[PDB]
Structures are given as structure tokens and as C-alpha cells.
């Protein structure tokens, strides 16, 4: 409701139909182990922001017991509950598109057979700042083509949710495990990518700071790992 | 009422995925058996055809049995005195099997590579099941394959559909005969998951979402203002 | 002349009454709809013949308010050229202050001038909150109603 406690973590939130369960499939086994809220560093949505992109499970790779079990076990299988909250007054306008893209293969900014380096396809808690400059070996950051050559308007076929600061300030997207294999290596392959894209730009009133924090809180749910490293050899 | 919009029917139609050209001539003093076009192998790549690539990449995953129709037609643009009656071996190399390097290799008589022997002018037809390693093919792969090192980000061997190799079983005549082979793939028992955005920009690579630089805007401009109908 | 996020944003302006906000025809194979998910899959086939689901979304501040009047001109007719002709036809007077998202079902067409028009006019001027001046934006959405058919599949080239 407003004191959702998951593990030793607790967040305060608002919902009436806020959870977007992706493709109407709740995450389920093929909690109570690594299921807690991991609250990423708040991004600053300024007036000239282009967007942010976090890879999952790569955004949670240093996050405590989850990131420990991610590198301890080879194979894993996790769903997610992603809360994106952009707290504001009733004077801010603007609109975020919080979208979850399964298998978001990125495009390099050099074209041809040039591929994106592991430094940039796995950026961690920092994510990809889409308003920054293209670095050598990084992805293309042109937000109109969704970093993959497909237009930004057609990004609503993926499980998405708007944060219209006029209407709400939170977006919850309940991600299941989406892959073509039943279990996979969590360290070399990103299942989904969370993107938070300002479509309508942030307008502040005169007398307000032209910036606004965005908090992403990812709770991994129904997280499984491989039976090896605890399976007996007898 | 909407049976044309099924993915069994939208993705399931015979497109031209490969057109190769092999020749019937002697290998006497022939070094390279590909520059001579004595044979041609082709890694089965449905994303080589950008009309079928743009339809397959409307989905994240796709699982289909395959269906290959092979049309071989001859041609003799030299002095010939007769049109020869030729037989083509259309050999399906499965995923993980070795490809031919010569037209008289051991691979052509390998029993585990299924091969079709058919006449030129006639047509071949066979079906290959789902030979992927995942439970579906990956139109898009956000990550690396099999390795912790650099593995090209989306280039994965899970999407290996096999290989088709083509030679003429016949020996040479005194004239050169040019057989052009057209492979027609039809995805059957198609099922697809996670619909994606349609691709607006053209392609630069296979297996990569890279679009060309300084390309043209896909959203086309009005002839007036936003109020102009 | 380039593709950008600003092309999805329908600009609204203060101190404009009885002007037009936007206006488009409803050929969903050309124009604004050619690159949408509807119009990329419509242009794989030849004949569509269904109802459309047209939405708008007001993204300006919670204190701003305006009345926009959302005219549907059916096919065969002329699109309106003042706010009053829009009101005398099929419309919604949509109060931006109250309803932040409007959903309008375009009637069954078989549209393949023609296909219909769709315009938006300022009923009232845009009232902005104090010392918050400039432009606010609309986001427009298109989809298909579940009676939408699609037949005689064809091939786009490049």
C-alpha cells in the first residue's frame, strides 16, 4: 500500500492500477532469498535530458546478495518489479515513458559490422545516459530510433507505462522472466532493458530548479539459480 | 475473418532466400573450387533477405519448421551442341557439421548430411525441423554467446539454421553449363513471441541492429503546417 | 526536416482562441500514420476496413486548463476551416483541466477527400499557471478497434 516491506527494505508508494504485468504473465517459478528493493542512484531529469537505459540483471550486478549470487552461480532466472518514481510538485509538467524492452539489442554509433563493447552493453547501476556523447565502442544514443533503428513512437508495443507529472508520478512494471531458454547466464546476457525516456520535456515554473529526480527501485522476484555448486557429487 | 493476419500466414510464405550459381566443368588444374563455382555452400540466413528480416524482427522470438524448395535451371552461353541432362546434389549441412571446401570432398558422401539429388529444370523440396538450440530463434540477442570475452553482442550460434551446399553430380562435357539455383524457404508451424517495434531505418549488418549514419529521416514532412490536413 | 521526439509533441500555445491545434486526414498508409505500428502493418496488406482508436494525452501542468474541441470529419466531407464548423459537426469539447487523456473511436470506414479528417480547435485559450509561460504539449495515439480486419497481403520494398 504505502509501507511495502520486502526483506529489510521498505518503500513508500502509490498505486491503484499502477502495476503493469508484462504480457499479462505474472513471474513464477519453473521470493524470500534475494527479494528486496534495490534502490538505484536517482537520476537528475533536467530540461535537456534525453533518457536513461538500464540493463537487467546488469543493473543489479553489485547489489548485495543478488549481485553476489549473480556471479557465484552461472545460470539464473529472475523476474522483476520495477518502480520508477519521479517525485514532483503540482507545478511541473512533462511526461516520461518508462518502457521495458525484452532483448534490447543496441546499435553501435559507427555502423556496419561494428559491435558495441562489453563496457557499454553492461553499464551497471549507472545505466546508459542517452543525453551524453557517443564514445568509441559504445551504442548509438539517438533516442528517436530507440538505440536499435526502430522509432520511438512504436516503443509502446513493449510493456510500458507513462509518468505524466500532471496525473501521476510513479510507474510500476512487473517483469517476468522472458527468454527462449529456461535458464541462462545472468552475467553475459541481459533479459530486459528498462528505459526511462522524457517524451514531453520537463517544464518548471519560474522560481523552480530546472531539474527533477527520478528514482528507480528494482525488486527481483521469483529469482532462481542453478542447482550446481550445491548439488552433491556423492 | 482475420486469417491472413495470423503469424502462421504472415510469416509463413515461400520467399526467395538464396540465389546461387554453380557451373559444370572439369577440375583439371582448378585451384579454388568456389572462384570456379564448382560448388557453393550457403549458411542458411533468413535475415539476408531484408523483406523477411523486417517481418521476422517484428517479434523477439520465432520458432518454425523450415521448408526448402530448390529450383535449378541451366544455361549454356557458349558453343554447346546440346543441352546436357544434369543432376544437382543439394546437400543440407546441419548445425555443427562441417561444410565442404572442395566439390569432391568427403562431406558430399557423408551420410549424416542429408542431400537431395534432383534434375536441373526440375525442382527439389524437403523440410528441416526446428534446428535451433533454444526453444525459439532469437531475432535479437541482448548479450554475448558462450563466453565471458568479446563475442560481438548478438552474434550467437543459437540461431544456426544449418547450411545448404550445392554441386553438380555430373562430370564435365566439352562445354560449360551454368546452373542457377534458387532456394525458396517457407517457414512452417510458425509461432512468435514478444512483438517489437517495426524497423524504420535500413540495415548495415546481419545479426546487428546497426543503422547507417547520416541516413534519411523516416518520418516524412508535411507539405504544410501541423494544421494542414 | 529531421526525426526527433518533438515530432510526437503537438504544441499548444497560450492566448490563442478559435485557432486550430492540429489537423490530419485519416489515410493510415500515408502521412502521420505511415510510421506508426498500425500503419506499418496496414501497409503490409492492401485492404484494411476497420474502426480506429484515437487517443490524446495532455502533458502540461496540473493547474493549466483549456477546452479543445476535437472534430471528426467523415470521408467525403470537407475538414472544417473555423472552430464553429467543427462544433456543428461531430466533436468532443474536451476540457484539458479535467480530463487529461481522451479516447475517441473513429467510426468504421473501409478507407482504401477520403478516409476522413480529424482536427482539433481551441474552444478556449490555454490558461497557464502563474509565471509558467511557454508551450505545453499533447501526445496523440492511434490503434485499431477489435473489429479491424486486414486482407490481401502485399510487399513493401525498402
Amino acid at each position, epitope marked *: 500500500v504505502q509501507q511495502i516491506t520486502l526483506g529489510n527494505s521498505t518503500i513508500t508508494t502509490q498505486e491503484a492500477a499502477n502495476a503493469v504485468v508484462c504480457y499479462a504473465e505474472w513471474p513464477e517459478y519453473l521470493d524470500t532469498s534475494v527479494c528486496r528493493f534495490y534502490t538505484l542512484d536517482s537520476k537528475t531529469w533536467t530540461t535537456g535530458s534525453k533518457g536513461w537505459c538500464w540493463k537487467l540483471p546488469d543493473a543489479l550486478k553489485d547489489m548485495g546478495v543478488f549481485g553476489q549470487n549473480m556471479f557465484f552461480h552461472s545460470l539464473g532466472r529472475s523476474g522483476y518489479t520495477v518502480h520508477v518514481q519521479c517525485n514532483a510538485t503540482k507545478f511541473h509538467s512533462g511526461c516520461l515513458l518508462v518502457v521495458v524492452i525484452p532483448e534490447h539489442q543496441l546499435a553501435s554509433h559507427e555502423g556496419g559490422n561494428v559491435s558495441v563493447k562489453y563496457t557499454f552493453t553492461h553499464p551497471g547501476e549507472r545505466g546508459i545516459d542517452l543525453s551524453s556523447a557517443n564514445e568509441v565502442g559504445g551504442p548509438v544514443k539517438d533516442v528517436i530510433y530507440n538505440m536499435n533503428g526502430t522509432l520511438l513512437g512504436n516503443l509502446l508495443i513493449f510493456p510500458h507505462q507513462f509518468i505524466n507529472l500532471r496525473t501521476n508520478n510513479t510507474a510500476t512494471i512487473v517483469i517476468p522472466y522472458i527468454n527462449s531458454v529456461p535458464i541462462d547466464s545472468m552475467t553475459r546476457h541481459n533479459n530486459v532493458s528498462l528505459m526511462v525516456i522524457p517524451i514531453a520535456p520537463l517544464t518548471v515554473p519560474t522560481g523552480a530548479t530546472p531539474s527533477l529526480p527520478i528514482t528507480v527501485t528494482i525488486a527481483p522476484m521469483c529469482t532462481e539459480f542453478s542447482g550446481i555448486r550445491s548439488k552433491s557429487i556423492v | 475473418n482475420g486469417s491472413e493476419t495470423d503469424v502462421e500466414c504472415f510469416l509463413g510464405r515461400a520467399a526467395c532466400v538464396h540465389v546461387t550459381e554453380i557451373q559444370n566443368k572439369d577440375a583439371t588444374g582448378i585451384d579454388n573450387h568456389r572462384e570456379a563455382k564448382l560448388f557453393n555452400d550457403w549458411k542458411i540466413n533468413l535475415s539476408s533477405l531484408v523483406q523477411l528480416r523486417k517481418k521476422l524482427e517484428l517479434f523477439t522470438y520465432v520458432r518454425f519448421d523450415s521448408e526448402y524448395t530448390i529450383l535449378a535451371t541451366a544455361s549454356q552461353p557458349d558453343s554447346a551442341n546440346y543441352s546436357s541432362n544434369l543432376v544437382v546434389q543439394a546437400m543440407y549441412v546441419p548445425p555443427g557439421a562441417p561444410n565442404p571446401k572442395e566439390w569432391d570432398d568427403y562431406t558430399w558422401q557423408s551420410a549424416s548430411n542429408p542431400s537431395v539429388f534432383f534434375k536441373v529444370g526440375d525442382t527439389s523440396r524437403f523440410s528441416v525441423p526446428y534446428v535451433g538450440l533454444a526453444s525459439a530463434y532469437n531475432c535479437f540477442y541482448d548479450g554475448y554467446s558462450h563466453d565471458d570475452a568479446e563475442t560481438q553482442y548478438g552474434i550467437t550460434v543459437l540461431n544456426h539454421m544449418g547450411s545448404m551446399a550445392f554441386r553438380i553430380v555430373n562430370e564435365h562435357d566439352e562445354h560449360k553449363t551454368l546452373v542457377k539455383i534458387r532456394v525458396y524457404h517457407r517457414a512452417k508451424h510458425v509461432e512468435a513471441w514478444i512483438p517489437r517495434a517495426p524497423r524504420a531505418l535500413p540495415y548495415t549488418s546481419i545479426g546487428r541492429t546497426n543503422y547507417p549514419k547520416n541516413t534519411e529521416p523516416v518520418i516524412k514532412k508535411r507539405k504544410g503546417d501541423i494544421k494542414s490536413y | 526536416t529531421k526525426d526527433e521526439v518533438n515530432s510526437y509533441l503537438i504544441p499548444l500555445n497560450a492566448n490563442r482562441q478559435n485557432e486550430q491545434v492540429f489537423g490530419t486526414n485519416l489515410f493510415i498508409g500515408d502521412g502521420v500514420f505511415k510510421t506508426t505500428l498500425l500503419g506499418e502493418i496496414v501497409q503490409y496488406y492492401t485492404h484494411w476496413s476497420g474502426s480506429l482508436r484515437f487517443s490524446l494525452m495532455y502533458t502540461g501542468p496540473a493547474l493549466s486548463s483549456a477546452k479543445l474541441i476535437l472534430a471528426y470529419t467523415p470521408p467525403g466531407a470537407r475538414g472544417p476551416q473555423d472552430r464553429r464548423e467543427a462544433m456543428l459537426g461531430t466533436h468532443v469539447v474536451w476540457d484539458i483541466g479535467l480530463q487529461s487523456t481522451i479516447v475517441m473511436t473513429i467510426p468504421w470506414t473501409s478507407g482504401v477527400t477520403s478516409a476522413g479528417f480529424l482536427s482539433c480547435w481551441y474552444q478556449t485559450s490555454l490558461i497557464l499557471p502563474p509565471e509558467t509561460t*511557454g*508551450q505545453v504539449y499533447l501526445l496523440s495515439f492511434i490503434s485499431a478497434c477489435p473489429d479491424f480486419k486486414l486482407r490481401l497481403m502485399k510487399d513493401t520494398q525498402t
Partner: antibody, heavy 116, light 107 residues
Framework: AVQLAESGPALVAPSQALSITCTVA????????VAWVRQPPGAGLEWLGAIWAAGATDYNAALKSRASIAKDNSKSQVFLAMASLATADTAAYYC??????????WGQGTTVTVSA | DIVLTQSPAALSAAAGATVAATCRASGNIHNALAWYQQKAGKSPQLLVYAAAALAAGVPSRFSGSGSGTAYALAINSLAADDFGAYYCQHFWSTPYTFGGGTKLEIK
């Protein structure tokens, strides 16, 4: 063709009014608005105001009191009037069409000098 | 009000040099800027609208850039026709104020 022919008396004593008009040939004032921009010689361009495509007008912050803009929709004429004229009003006055709410199709402009 | 400060005031360059006029606003224009070109005794003509989009009848030598408050007008490989006074105008919040102006002269 979209053309906006400026027309003014151009010889006006100060502390008087202005009847400097723009006949609109090519488009309609009900579907587009007209922006007014003056430029004194030596100094740069200065916005005066814009009557919108249906009635509404905007002005300079310093010239809300002096300037006033109306239009005739049938005769396609746009009217600019100013009160309490000074020597700083010696300027070529221009009309425009509002293209994407910007300003273009500027006429050649009538140089209107306020003199004794 | 949004006040445009167009720096510099005048530039001396040859036909082929790169000219980068600059406008910086007090408020945030949100890329709703228009650049103008004017000759001696001629009407101003529109070069760049929306701070990046070249207008109709504008060559590809002109290139609008910049976002937010600061906006550059980079002109590459000048010709003989491209000498004159250049004025910004923002079209965001009514009033639509101009900038100061950059004139081009030959070295």
C-alpha cells in the same frame, strides 16, 4: 503565392496615429496569423506583435499601450496602429505569415519616418 | 520575458571561412528558435527554424545547432551571397524577442 504587401503613409508627425496596413494575397487571415516586426536604420530588428489566426493579439512588453493590431478577414487586410509617436519609430515595418508559428514570407516593408 | 543576447556583434571573414553565430537566452526556449538573414535594404529571410531545421530555399552550408538556452548557427564554406546581419528570434512564450545581431564583413 504567399505575399504580404505593406502599405503606409510614411510621413507622419509625432503624437499622432499610424494606419500602416498589409494586404494579404495568397492565403486567408482565418487560417494563419500575421507577425509585425520593425527595424530602425542602424539598429536591429524588433518584434512589434502578432495577431493570431483567429482574433487574439500579442504585443511587446513595452508596447502594449502604444501598439494595437486588428484585421479584416474578408478584405484580407492587417492593421497596425500606434499612439504617442516618437523619433524612435522611424523604421521599416514588416508583415509575415506564421509558418509553424515562426515568421516568414516577409514583404519588402514600408519605411515610415516620423518627422516634424 | 526571455531576453536573447546574440554574441558577437560583427565578424570579419573571407568567403570559405567558418562562421558560428551564437544566441543565448535567459529562459529556456526548448528549441523553439528561428534564425534570420537580412541584406542591406532587403527583407529578412528565414534560414533555420526549430534551432536545427533548415527552412525552404536554404542551402546546406547553414547548420543550426544547440539546445536549451545556447544555440549556435554554424555556417561552413561561406559564399559571396552569405554576407549580412543575422538575428535570432525565439517563438516560445509571447513576446517573441530578437537578438542583437551578427553582421558579416570581408577581411
Amino acid at each position: 503565392a504567399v505575399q504580404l504587401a505593406e502599405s503606409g503613409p510614411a510621413l507622419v508627425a509625432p503624437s499622432q496615429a499610424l494606419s500602416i496596413t498589409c494586404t494579404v494575397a495568397g492565403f486567408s487571415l482565418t487560417a494563419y496569423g500575421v507577425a509585425w516586426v520593425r527595424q530602425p536604420p542602424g539598429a536591429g530588428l524588433e518584434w512589434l506583435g502578432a495577431i493570431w489566426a483567429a482574433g487574439a493579439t500579442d504585443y511587446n512588453a513595452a508596447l502594449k499601450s502604444r501598439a494595437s493590431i486588428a484585421k479584416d478577414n474578408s478584405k484580407s487586410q492587417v492593421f497596425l496602429a500606434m499612439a504617442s509617436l516618437a523619433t524612435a519609430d522611424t523604421a521599416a515595418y514588416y508583415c509575415a505569415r506564421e509558418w509553424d508559428a515562426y515568421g516568414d514570407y516577409w514583404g519588402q516593408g514600408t519605411t515610415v519616418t516620423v518627422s516634424a | 520575458d526571455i531576453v536573447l543576447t546574440q554574441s558577437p556583434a560583427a565578424l570579419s571573414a573571407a568567403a570559405g571561412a567558418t562562421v558560428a553565430a551564437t544566441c543565448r537566452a535567459s529562459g529556456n526556449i526548448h528549441n523553439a528558435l528561428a534564425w534570420y538573414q537580412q541584406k542591406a535594404g532587403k527583407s529578412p529571410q528565414l534560414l533555420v527554424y526549430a534551432a536545427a531545421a533548415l527552412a525552404a530555399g536554404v542551402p546546406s552550408r547553414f547548420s543550426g545547432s544547440g539546445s536549451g538556452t545556447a544555440y549556435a548557427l554554424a555556417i561552413n564554406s561561406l559564399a559571396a551571397d552569405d554576407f549580412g546581419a543575422y538575428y535570432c528570434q525565439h517563438f516560445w512564450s509571447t513576446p517573441y524577442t530578437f537578438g542583437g545581431g551578427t553582421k558579416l564583413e570581408i577581411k
